[PDB]
Amino acid sequence: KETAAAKFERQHMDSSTSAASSSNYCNQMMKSRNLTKDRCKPVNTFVHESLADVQAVCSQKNVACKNGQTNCYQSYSTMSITDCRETGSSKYPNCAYKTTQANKHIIVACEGNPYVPVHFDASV
Numbered sequence: 737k738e739t740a741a742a743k744f745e746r747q748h749m750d751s752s753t754s755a756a757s758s759s760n761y762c763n764q765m766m767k768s769r770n771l772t773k774d775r776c777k778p779v780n781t782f783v784h785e786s787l788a789d790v791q792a793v794c795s796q797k798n799v800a801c802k803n804g805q806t807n808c809y810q811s812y813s814t815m816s817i818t819d820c821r822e823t824g825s826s827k828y829p830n831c832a833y834k835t836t837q838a839n840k841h842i843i844v845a846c847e848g849n850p851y852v853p854v855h856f857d858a859s860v
């Protein structure tokens with residue numbers, strides 16, 4: 737079965753591109769990562785850094801989580817990311833997304849032993 741750590745990797749990791757993310761990127765990735773199977777997931781972020789670098793965030797700057805938990809961490813450095821946002825005309829099963837590359841600090845929630853990312857909270 738798929739662990740929370742694996743789900744985070746599926747939903748949020750894309751180390752293969754540095755982030756020349758085409759206009760087509762979100763359309764393709766939201767589908768291929770199975771984020772459009774049940775509904776169109778409204779928003780989602782992909783991180784274009786190594787797994788090691790993203791895992792390392794769990795020992796970086798501790799910040800409050802949006803849900804009020806205390807297990808969130810902000811990256812000390814900016815990271816290459818791509819935000820995917822569902823368009824107004826997007827209609828499930830044909831989910832359509834605006835692709836936006838940015839370089840921002842990421843905030844992730846971590847759990848477990850080993851202590852690893854399980855939720856993408858924000859970018860700042």
Ligand SMILES: Nc1ncnc2c1ncn2[C@@H]1O[C@H](COP(=O)(O)O)[C@@H](O)[C@H]1O
Binds near residue numbers: 747847855
């Ligand atoms: N502080 C947290 N620790 C662990 N999981 C969380 C936290 N905050 C939210 N979540 C949930 O973790 C799941 C993964 O989120 P996402 O990475 O957005 O798919 C979501 O269902 C969130 O509601």
